Structure 1
Amino acid sequence: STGSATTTPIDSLDDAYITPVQIGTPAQTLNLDFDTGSSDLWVFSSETTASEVDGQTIYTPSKSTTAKLLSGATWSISYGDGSSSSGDVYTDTVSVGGLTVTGQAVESAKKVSSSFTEDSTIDGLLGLAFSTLNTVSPTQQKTFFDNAKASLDSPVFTADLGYHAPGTYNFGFIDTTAYTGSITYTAVSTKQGFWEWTSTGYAVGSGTFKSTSIDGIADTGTTLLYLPATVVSAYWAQVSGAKSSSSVGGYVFPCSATLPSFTFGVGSARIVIPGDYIDFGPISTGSSSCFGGIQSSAGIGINIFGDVALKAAFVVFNGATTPTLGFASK
């Protein structure tokens, strides 16, 4: 089997991407944030505290003839931006882009933090990291991809995120028309539950490539590119007027600037992030200070190749017995 679904930015800055997902019988379609950095499929639901729902589409298990309470199971998750959610669990039929999994754990939110409430466009998350991170207790549950894997034509999914445009998530096949040149594959460590890999270095603009190992994760659920302070300083030093602002919470730059590109290494291959991808616009409406898309990972504890990086590439998440990651230009 295979599946193919379009993923669409939630706003004009590509702050996140939503992908329609069919849950239950008859189908209830929710727009979920596919997140290769976590491993819970959770949704706004008929159980979510009413004051914490503000425009989201909700899953109502009592209206699904295939929904079953997973008795005794609960979940609770916190993310790197300090957001959180928690609740109980149903199993139900879940389809993405024509690919159907029966008996998928669908985690129903009883509580969500303010940032989720405040984002009316995201109806929940669909985790695509390794199932070892799944938070369901006392019986840990599998991700949609893990459940689907054995039925897929090939045990892979691909992320093809657009810059200010829709893109695609494919399951079970590699669309050889969706990228240019060849795909360079690189080793993955699953020790922390992530799609963790090591970039071979970076360049800023037309500058020389610096060979250096940068361990990080391929995370579709994180907006920006978070890298070591040394690397980030070298990038922003090429932008007149750019500075790190503790009050804003990162690097900002004059909105009048033309940003240089940023290149990262994948083995001997190179992925180029155009400068425009690194512009996240005014820090507040009408401001002439703009927020940077490359930020320091110091104090996160991990480097994160988020959407800013991933959207510059066609990315293969290879879930074979020894997982790997592939990157191609596009």
Structure 2
Amino acid sequence: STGSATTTPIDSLDDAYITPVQIGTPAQTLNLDFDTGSSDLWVFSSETTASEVDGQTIYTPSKSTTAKLLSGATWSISYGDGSSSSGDVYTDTVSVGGLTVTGQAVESAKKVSSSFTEDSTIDGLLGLAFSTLNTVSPTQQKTFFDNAKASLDSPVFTADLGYHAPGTYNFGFIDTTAYTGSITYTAVSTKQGFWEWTSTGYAVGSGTFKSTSIDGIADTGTTLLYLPATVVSAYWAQVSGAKSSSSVGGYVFPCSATLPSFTFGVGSARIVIPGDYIDFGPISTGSSSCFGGIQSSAGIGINIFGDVALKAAFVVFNGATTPTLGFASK
């Protein structure tokens, strides 16, 4: 089997991407944030505290003839940005782009933090990291990909995020019309539960490539590119007027600037992020100070190849017995 679904930016900055997901019988369609940095599929629901729902579409399990309470199971998750959610668990039928999994753990939110309430466009998350990170207790549950893997034509999914434009998530097959050149595959460590790999170095604009190993994760659920402070300083030093602002919480730059590209290494290959992808617009409405799309990881504890980096590529998440990542230009 295979599946194919369009993913769409939630706003003009590509702050995140939503993908429609069918849950239950009859189908209830919710728009979920596919997140290769986490492993829980959770939804706003009829159980969510009423004051914490503001415009989201909710899953109502009592209206699904295939929903069943997973007796005694609870979940609770905190994300790197400080947001969180928690609740109870049903199993139900879940379909993405024509690919159906029966018995998928659908984690129903009883509580969500303010940043989720305030984002009316995201109805929940669909985790695509390794199932070892799933938070369901006392019986950990599998991700949608893990459940589908054996039925898929090939045990893979691909991320093709657009720049200010829709893109595609495919399950079970590699669309050879979606990229240019060849796909370069690179080793993955699953020891932290992430799609963790090692970049071979970087370049700033037209500058020379610096060969240096950068360990980090391929994370569709993080907006920006978070890299070591040495690398980030080398980038922003090429932008007149750019500076790190403790009050804003990262590097800012004059909105009048033209930003240079940033290249990252994948083995012997190179992925080029155009400068425009690194502009996240005014820090506040009407400001002439703009927020940078490349930021220091020094306070995180891990480097993060988020959407800024991934949307410059066609990315293969290969879940074969030894997982790997593939990157191609497009």
Q: TM-score, normalised by structure 1?
A: 1.00
- How far apart, CA to CA, are the structure 2 residues paired with 1:111 and 1:240? 44
Instruction: Kindly provide the CA deviation profile for residues 195-216 of structure 1, in whole angstroms up to 9, marking residues without a partner as x.
Output: 0000000000000000000000
Instruction: Kindly provide the CA deviation profile for residues 164-185 of structure 1, in whole angstroms up to 9, marking residues without a partner as x.
Output: 0000000000000000000000
Ranges of 4+ aligned residues in structure 1 off by more than 3 Å: none
- How far apart, CA to CA, are the structure 2 residues paired with 1:252 and 1:299? 17
- How far apart, CA to CA, are the structure 2 residues paired with 1:298 and 1:83? 20
- How far apart, CA to CA, are the structure 1 residues paired with 2:88 and 2:233? 44
Match of 2:274 in 1: 274
Q: What's the offset of the Cα at 1:223?
A: 0.1
Instruction: Kindly provide the CA deviation profile for residues 128-173 of structure 1, in whole angstroms up to 9, marking residues without a partner as x.
Output: 0000000000000000000000000000000000000000000000
- How far apart, CA to CA, are the structure 2 residues paired with 1:122 and 1:191? 29
- How far apart, CA to CA, are the structure 1 residues paired with 2:276 and 2:299? 26
Total equivalences in the alignment: 330
Q: What SS is found at the alignment partner of 1:206? A: coil
CA RMSD, 1 decimal: 0.1
Q: What SS is found at the alignment partner of 1:136? A: coil
- How far apart, CA to CA, are the structure 2 residues paired with 1:109 and 1:8? 23
- How far apart, CA to CA, are the structure 1 residues paired with 2:95 and 2:249? 38
- How far apart, CA to CA, are the structure 1 residues paired with 2:214 and 2:272? 16
Q: What's the offset of the Cα at 1:312?
A: 0.0
Match of 1:215 in 2: 215
Instruction: Kindly provide the CA deviation profile for residues 280-320 of structure 1, in whole angstroms up to 9, marking residues without a partner as x.
Output: 00000000000000000001000000000000000000000
Q: What's the offset of the Cα at 1:324?
A: 0.0
- How far apart, CA to CA, are the structure 1 residues paired with 2:85 and 2:243? 34
- How far apart, CA to CA, are the structure 1 residues paired with 2:172 and 2:118? 34
Q: What SS is found at the alignment partner of 1:287? A: coil
Instruction: Kindly provide the CA deviation profile for residues 60-113 of structure 1, in whole angstroms up to 9, marking residues without a partner as x.
Output: 000000000000000000000000000000000000000000000000000000
- How far apart, CA to CA, are the structure 1 residues paired with 2:297 and 2:197? 16
Q: What SS is found at the alignment partner of 1:240? A: coil
Q: What SS is found at the alignment partner of 2:108? A: strand
- Show structure 1 runs of 5+ residues with no match: none
Match of 1:75 in 2: 75
Q: What's the offset of the Cα at 1:54?
A: 0.1
- How far apart, CA to CA, are the structure 1 residues paired with 2:299 and 2:260? 26
Q: What SS is found at the alignment partner of 2:308? A: helix
- How far apart, CA to CA, are the structure 1 residues paired with 2:299 and 2:9? 28
Q: TM-score, normalised by structure 2?
A: 1.00
- How far apart, CA to CA, are the structure 1 residues paired with 2:112 and 2:230? 36
- How far apart, CA to CA, are the structure 1 residues paired with 2:314 and 2:204? 21
Q: What SS is found at the alignment partner of 1:232? A: helix
- How far apart, CA to CA, are the structure 2 residues paired with 1:71 and 1:175? 40
Instruction: Kindly provide the CA deviation profile for residues 258-295 of structure 1, in whole angstroms up to 9, marking residues without a partner as x.
Output: 00000000000000000000000000000000000000
- How far apart, CA to CA, are the structure 1 residues paired with 2:278 and 2:80? 20
Q: What's the offset of the Cα at 1:241?
A: 0.2
- How far apart, CA to CA, are the structure 1 residues paired with 2:292 and 2:306? 13
Q: What SS is found at the alignment partner of 1:32? A: strand
Match of 1:153 in 2: 153
Match of 2:96 in 1: 96
Instruction: Kindly provide the CA deviation profile for residues 10-36 of structure 1, in whole angstroms up to 9, marking residues without a partner as x.
Output: 000000000000000000000000000
- Show structure 2 runs of 5+ residues with no match: none
Percent identical pairs in the alignment equals 100
Q: What SS is found at the alignment partner of 2:162? A: coil
- How far apart, CA to CA, are the structure 2 residues paired with 1:247 and 1:88? 38
Q: What SS is found at the alignment partner of 1:189? A: coil
Match of 1:231 in 2: 231
